[PDB]
Amino acid sequence: LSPVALRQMSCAAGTTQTACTDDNALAYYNTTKGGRFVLALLSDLQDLKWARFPKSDGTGTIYTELEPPCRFVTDTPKGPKVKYLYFIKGLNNLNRGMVLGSLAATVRLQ
Amino acid sequence: NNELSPVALRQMSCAAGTTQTACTDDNALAYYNTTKGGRFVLALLSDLQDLKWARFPKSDGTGTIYTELEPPCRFVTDTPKGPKVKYLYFIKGLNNLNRGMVLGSLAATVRLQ
Numbered sequence: 563l564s565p566v567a568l569r570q571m572s573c574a575a576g577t578t579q580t581a582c583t584d585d586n587a588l589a590y591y592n593t594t595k596g597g598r599f600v601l602a603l604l605s606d607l608q609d610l611k612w613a614r615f616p617k618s619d620g621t622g623t624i625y626t627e628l629e630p631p632c633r634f635v636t637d638t639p640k641g642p643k644v645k646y647l648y649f650i651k652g653l654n655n656l657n658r659g660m661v662l663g664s665l666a667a668t669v670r671l672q
Numbered sequence: 673n674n675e676l677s678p679v680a681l682r683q684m685s686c687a688a689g690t691t692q693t694a695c696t697d698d699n700a701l702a703y704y705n706t707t708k709g710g711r712f713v714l715a716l717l718s719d720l721q722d723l724k725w726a727r728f729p730k731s732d733g734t735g736t737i738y739t740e741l742e743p744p745c746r747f748v749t750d751t752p753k754g755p756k757v758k759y760l761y762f763i764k765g766l767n768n769l770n771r772g773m774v775l776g777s778l779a780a781t782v783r784l785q
Binding site: 563564565566567568630631632633634647654655656657658659660661662663664665666667668671672 | 674675676678679680681745746747767768769770771772773774775776777778779780781783784
């Protein structure tokens with residue numbers, strides 16, 4: 563399948579749908595035909611279960627369930643930092659790989 | 673418990689051709705993973721659309737490894753010298769996770785049309 567730019571945007575996630583309050587995650591997403599398809603979230607927090615995305619037309623909000631997070635380490639000026647990678651529930655391996663390849667290009671892994 | 677053993681894809685020039693004998697000059701870029709034992713090649717990128725084999729000399733100098741390629745995926749990247757048509761060749765049999773890693777790396781690092 564020919565590739566499509568993966569982009570990032572801040573977003574609210576939380577333990578519960580109601581707990582999605584302020585911006586605490588970075589969503590990795592696709593701009594497809596009728597709206598953005600979020601594949602994964604990146605966060606400092608390890609207990610997220612839900613992400614929240616306003617539709618761009620303003621007609622509503624989408625809540626996406628998260629898989630258990632994948633812990634990984636990034637190289638920063640302040641030293642190594644632990645982060646959590648949350649695939650969207652049910653994401654297939656092709657899309658998981660795309661997230662991983664975009665992640666390696668956009669954060670200083672290991 | 674769930675910890676990510678990640679990897680960035682590296683790139684190396686490599687030889688490819690329509691036949692094994694036609695692999696002579698380095699006319700593609702191979703995307704590969706460095707593993708503790710050897711380089712794992714996932715895919716080739718080339719201007720050429722008719723490639724079927726990639727060639728890599730064995731690390732010792734003993735012999736040669738020929739890797740067969742899937743049919744190419746055509747895409748257009750935006751470069752300073754204007755748009756350039758490229759062809760992405762997965763290694764024959766590459767699983768979907770590794771296919772995604774290449775597709776995700778590309779789309780994250782080049783501008784596409």
